[PDB]
Short mmCIF file of C-alpha atoms and ligand atoms in Angstrom, two decimals:
data_model
loop_
_atom_site.label_atom_id
_atom_site.label_comp_id
_atom_site.label_asym_id
_atom_site.label_seq_id
_atom_site.Cartn_x
_atom_site.Cartn_y
_atom_site.Cartn_z
CA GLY A 50 51.43 3.38 -20.75
CA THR A 51 54.40 2.23 -20.63
CA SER A 52 56.43 3.16 -23.46
CA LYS A 53 57.98 6.39 -22.93
CA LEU A 54 59.29 4.71 -19.44
CA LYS A 55 60.14 2.10 -21.97
CA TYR A 56 62.63 4.48 -23.93
CA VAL A 57 63.62 6.08 -20.45
CA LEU A 58 65.39 1.95 -19.70
CA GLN A 59 66.76 2.49 -23.23
CA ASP A 60 70.34 0.90 -22.86
CA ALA A 61 70.37 2.07 -19.63
CA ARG A 62 72.35 1.37 -16.10
CA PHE A 63 70.81 0.65 -12.69
CA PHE A 64 71.94 0.71 -9.22
CA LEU A 65 70.23 -0.46 -6.06
CA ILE A 66 70.20 1.76 -3.48
CA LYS A 67 69.59 0.10 -0.15
CA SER A 68 68.55 2.39 2.93
CA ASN A 69 68.69 2.14 6.77
CA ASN A 70 65.12 3.81 7.34
CA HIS A 71 62.09 4.90 5.32
CA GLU A 72 63.09 9.15 6.26
CA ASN A 73 65.95 9.11 3.61
CA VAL A 74 63.68 7.56 1.02
CA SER A 75 61.23 10.02 2.34
CA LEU A 76 63.18 13.21 1.80
CA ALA A 77 65.26 11.58 -1.35
CA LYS A 78 61.61 11.57 -2.80
CA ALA A 79 60.71 15.36 -1.34
CA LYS A 80 64.02 17.20 -2.51
CA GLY A 81 65.52 15.39 -6.18
CA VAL A 82 68.28 14.11 -4.37
CA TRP A 83 69.67 11.15 -3.03
CA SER A 84 74.21 10.94 -1.83
CA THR A 85 76.49 7.75 -1.16
CA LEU A 86 79.45 7.06 0.63
CA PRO A 87 82.49 8.11 -1.73
CA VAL A 88 83.00 4.43 -2.77
CA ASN A 89 79.26 4.29 -4.33
CA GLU A 90 79.80 7.57 -5.98
CA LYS A 91 82.73 7.13 -8.08
CA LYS A 92 80.63 4.30 -9.26
CA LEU A 93 77.44 6.38 -9.72
CA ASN A 94 79.89 9.26 -11.49
CA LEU A 95 81.62 6.91 -13.73
CA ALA A 96 77.92 5.56 -14.67
CA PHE A 97 76.54 8.89 -15.14
CA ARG A 98 78.86 9.88 -17.73
CA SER A 99 79.11 6.42 -19.68
CA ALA A 100 75.60 5.90 -20.48
CA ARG A 101 71.42 7.54 -21.79
CA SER A 102 70.09 6.98 -18.34
CA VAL A 103 71.41 5.55 -14.50
CA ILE A 104 68.80 3.94 -12.06
CA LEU A 105 68.71 4.45 -8.71
CA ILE A 106 66.55 1.78 -7.26
CA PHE A 107 65.72 1.56 -3.88
CA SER A 108 64.62 -0.10 -1.24
CA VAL A 109 64.87 0.34 2.95
CA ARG A 110 66.10 -2.85 4.52
CA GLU A 111 64.31 -4.98 6.87
CA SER A 112 60.56 -4.12 4.23
CA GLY A 113 60.20 -6.26 2.16
CA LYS A 114 59.68 -4.35 -0.85
CA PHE A 115 61.96 -1.20 -2.83
CA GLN A 116 59.78 2.20 -2.40
CA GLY A 117 60.41 3.47 -6.03
CA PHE A 118 63.11 4.04 -8.45
CA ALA A 119 64.88 7.45 -9.83
CA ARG A 120 66.89 8.43 -12.68
CA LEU A 121 70.12 10.13 -12.32
CA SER A 122 70.15 14.32 -13.60
CA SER A 123 73.52 14.69 -12.64
CA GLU A 124 76.58 14.25 -11.14
CA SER A 125 77.82 14.28 -7.38
CA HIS A 126 78.13 18.41 -6.11
CA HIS A 127 79.23 19.95 -3.03
CA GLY A 128 78.54 22.47 -1.33
CA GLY A 129 74.52 22.38 -1.85
CA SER A 130 71.73 23.33 -0.19
CA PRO A 131 72.68 20.77 3.12
CA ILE A 132 70.06 18.20 4.10
CA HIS A 133 68.72 16.70 7.26
CA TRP A 134 69.72 12.78 6.34
CA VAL A 135 69.24 10.51 9.21
CA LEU A 136 72.54 8.75 9.56
CA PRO A 137 72.98 4.99 10.34
CA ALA A 138 74.03 4.60 13.67
CA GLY A 139 78.27 5.53 13.86
CA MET A 140 78.63 7.26 10.77
CA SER A 141 78.94 10.98 10.27
CA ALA A 142 77.55 13.33 7.71
CA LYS A 143 81.26 14.07 6.56
CA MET A 144 81.46 10.61 5.11
CA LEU A 145 79.11 10.82 2.97
CA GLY A 146 80.12 12.77 -0.74
CA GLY A 147 78.47 14.75 -2.70
CA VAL A 148 75.02 14.95 -3.48
CA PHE A 149 73.01 13.61 -7.28
CA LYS A 150 70.46 15.37 -8.63
CA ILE A 151 67.26 12.40 -9.40
CA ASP A 152 64.43 12.88 -10.81
CA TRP A 153 62.08 10.61 -9.75
CA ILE A 154 59.87 7.95 -12.43
CA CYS A 155 58.10 5.83 -10.47
CA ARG A 156 57.27 6.61 -6.65
CA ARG A 157 55.16 3.70 -5.98
CA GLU A 158 56.29 0.35 -3.66
CA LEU A 159 57.33 -3.23 -5.16
CA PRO A 160 56.98 -5.99 -3.17
CA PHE A 161 59.93 -8.40 -3.27
CA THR A 162 56.93 -11.04 -3.74
CA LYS A 163 56.76 -9.98 -7.11
CA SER A 164 60.10 -10.04 -8.24
CA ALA A 165 61.09 -13.76 -7.29
CA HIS A 166 61.92 -14.55 -11.18
CA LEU A 167 63.78 -11.46 -11.46
CA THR A 168 68.25 -12.53 -10.84
CA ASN A 169 70.59 -10.73 -11.17
CA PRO A 170 73.78 -11.85 -13.03
CA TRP A 171 75.41 -9.96 -11.81
CA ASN A 172 75.32 -10.21 -8.35
CA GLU A 173 76.23 -15.07 -8.52
CA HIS A 174 71.99 -15.34 -10.21
CA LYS A 175 70.70 -14.67 -6.74
CA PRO A 176 67.44 -12.19 -7.00
CA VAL A 177 67.59 -8.94 -7.77
CA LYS A 178 65.74 -8.62 -3.54
CA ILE A 179 69.80 -9.17 -3.17
CA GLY A 180 72.49 -6.82 -2.89
CA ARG A 181 74.61 -4.31 -1.03
CA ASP A 182 73.93 -1.16 -0.97
CA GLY A 183 75.04 0.36 -5.18
CA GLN A 184 75.37 -3.25 -5.95
CA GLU A 185 75.12 -2.78 -10.58
CA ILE A 186 72.32 -4.40 -11.16
CA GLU A 187 71.85 -6.09 -15.04
CA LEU A 188 70.44 -4.43 -17.74
CA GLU A 189 67.34 -7.01 -18.44
CA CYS A 190 66.97 -7.40 -14.91
CA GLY A 191 66.78 -4.16 -13.92
CA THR A 192 64.76 -2.90 -16.99
CA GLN A 193 62.24 -6.10 -15.89
CA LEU A 194 62.00 -4.90 -12.09
CA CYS A 195 61.43 -1.24 -13.87
CA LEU A 196 58.37 -2.03 -15.72
CA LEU A 197 56.78 -4.94 -12.54
CA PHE A 198 56.31 -1.50 -10.74
CA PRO A 199 53.37 -0.67 -10.25
CA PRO A 200 52.68 2.50 -13.20
CA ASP A 201 52.99 6.06 -11.13
CA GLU A 202 50.45 8.25 -12.96
CA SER A 203 51.40 11.02 -11.05
CA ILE A 204 54.82 11.77 -13.48
CA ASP A 205 55.28 12.92 -16.94
CA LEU A 206 58.87 11.27 -18.81
CA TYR A 207 58.27 13.93 -21.25
CA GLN A 208 60.63 17.27 -19.35
CA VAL A 209 63.01 13.40 -18.37
CA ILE A 210 63.05 12.12 -22.44
CA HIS A 211 64.33 15.45 -23.07
CA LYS A 212 67.44 15.91 -20.30
CA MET A 213 68.66 12.17 -22.06
CA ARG A 214 71.35 13.27 -23.54
C1 OWH B 1715 71.59 9.64 2.58
N1 OWH B 1715 72.24 8.19 2.32
C2 OWH B 1715 72.90 8.41 3.62
S1 OWH B 1715 71.85 7.43 4.63
C3 OWH B 1715 73.63 6.97 3.04
C4 OWH B 1715 74.24 5.62 4.83
C5 OWH B 1715 75.18 5.26 4.59
C6 OWH B 1715 75.77 5.02 2.71
N2 OWH B 1715 74.63 5.51 1.56
C7 OWH B 1715 74.01 5.82 1.80
#
């Protein structure tokens, strides 16, 4: 192991990403990308410049689980390869902001039952599973949440460490 993981998470910022469906998380895992609404895009871009690591922790709505977590490797950009997201009903692709590149740190799931002892000070100390898309998770809570995930032995954090910074 957990030492490189702890190193990557040291003084990180953490954001809860709430996905409408599993398809979009599958695309994010396959392509190493995420795109969010402009209100959250601006927050993530600010955070990317502010901290050594910015961690997105993903949860598919109604799944009762987190599906993994990833580290921003870039601010958002436009004009790249299109991504065929499965958008919420009533939302067009033009409503999204740009695309963030991300490096996955853990592609394994964690059920909410395992994080019930973690509360987020930045959301009224509600359980960390509770939060709108884009809710920031305070450092200690976010670190402990990430450490609860099963180890993902397919991941080598050596290359992520070199990107820090
Ligand atoms: C791929 N991004 C999607 S589906 C989304 C939708 C609404 C808010 N944030 C993100």
